Point group: C3
Chain length 216, copies 3
């Protein structure tokens, strides 16, 4: 359609949907409560993302934000997506290592500030302030990674580093993309987030559910 990035949105929609179907079928039959837990969590994340990519695709999860003298398309549904899926992803790690509740709360808590401040950064009309919110969000992401390292083992370790490399990519792509300094066109900005999202929402899950660590 009229938006260059549409094919990336259409591809992410498709891959999230297929990933959703795949885990739904994969999950059928699980009777082990613990495994049930990782299956629910892991199936729900691309289901949520599927509906969010579709709203972006259909143009509903998109808005225009004025700044830098320009009218700027902002996909707010990306953040609405992360707002619900990043805490579940952290839930999978939590459950893996059996984190106690104060840690889980701090994690989930830091994550909501991460995405909420980043959504504020996204919608802020004062150009310079957007980077203030990028900074606080990035600070929160770093606390989350800090806990992950200093706050099953082998699978945990695997998903941990996947997480590091994947989650730390989101900050840069924000910065260089159209929501930030405006280094890379929106069209390529959407492509990168799609590739991260699918790796984080489907790839991560394939890696976790194919492991016996999820089993009591």
């Amino acid at each position: 359609t009229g938006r260059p990035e549409w094919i990336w949105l259409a591809l992410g929609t498709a891959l999230m949907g297929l990933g959703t179907l795949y885990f739904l079928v994969k999950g059928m039959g699980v009777s082990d409560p613990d495994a049930k837990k990782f299956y629910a969590i892991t199936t729900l994340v691309p289901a949520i993302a599927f509906t969010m990519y579709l709203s972006m695709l259909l143009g509903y999860g998109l808005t225009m934000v004025p700044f830098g003298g320009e009218q700027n398309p902002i996909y707010w549904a990306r953040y609405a997506d992360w707002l619900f899926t990043t805490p579940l992803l952290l839930l999978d790690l939590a459950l893996l290592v059996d984190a106690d509740q104060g840690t889980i709360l701090a994690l989930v808590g830091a994550d909501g500030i991460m995405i909420g401040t980043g959504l504020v950064g996204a919608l802020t009309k004062v150009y310079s302030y957007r980077f203030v919110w990028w900074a606080i969000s990035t600070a929160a992401m770093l606390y989350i990674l800090y806990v992950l390292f200093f706050g099953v083992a082998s699978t945990f370790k695997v998903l941990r580093n996947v997480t590091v490399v994947l989650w730390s990519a989101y900050p840069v792509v924000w910065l260089i993309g159209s929501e930030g300094a405006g280094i890379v066109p929106l069209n390529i900005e959407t492509l990168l987030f799609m590739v991260l999202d699918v790796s984080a929402k489907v790839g991560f899950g394939l890696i976790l559910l194919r492991s016996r660590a999820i089993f009591g």
Copy 2:
């Protein structure tokens, strides 16, 4: 007032308020933690709905959505209502049959997508796409009913079928009402949702709390 549907909104407000008072008084004295749980859950649901019908009544939870060439009044507060009460209703069943946590999460998870996609459907300006969101929401509702059947007993069974007949009514009324194909005037569309809501928010609760199944 100026809106035909006002008397239905005023009636739902009144019935939810009275239902709220009734359970609040009913609940006083409960010392059994488990029963306490069903009382809180069941009292909270019409309290939330009371405030939401009032915002609709007062006109705050109402907006106009353009599509089909027309400006269309949409009661978004209906969805804000279901967003918080449908998961608690599912909580009551969950607690009844002592569902494990992976099931509860999948249930609560599918329910949030159900109402969120249906709210997107409600606010979408592209006529044809609204039905796409109706379809995904309906798909999620069907997963929720699927779990309910394939995922205390007697009371469970009773509330289960009440749930089936009541929840499956919401899809049709969306379709034929003004938010969809536009078969039934808004005025009658509001009347039907009010009747469902009160049966689902008060009737359901009367049935559950009058049972000893809620007792350890």
Copy 3:
């Protein structure tokens, strides 16, 4: 800047940030899961508030609401703040006295209606109706205080009365401030909420975390 209340917003930002840092450092080393719980909860609350005061300061969490024939600046981010921090504050008391789950739910449930109805009151364009929402919110606050009194001991008692005096201040300041009857200028309205917020978000926490009651 152009807004008189800015210095109060800047002061609250600063005090919440410093309070956040202070507990973060204070919390380092805690290994006792229960204590971990009060530390997470208590550190998260001014972190959330920090980001919300900053959005108010920067002007992002501010909007204009028409009523009384005038265009009226409303800091909606104040409510977005309370929406997440008041339930955690109640969590600290809950955990103190080891409230059972039906109580916690009723508490958290009444609190969300409290702030949500008060946010509706804040954004309502019909002058007289704002006070209807003030009334329902106040009713919910009273239920929350009722439970607190009729629904560790010594610390509980201390935080309980702090809570009473602090939380009951918010209703009056709404009433006399610019969001209500318009008795006190916005500039002083913001000052009072800042003083309450910092006492409720930092002061309360200093009092709780300096106690051994948080320890198993």
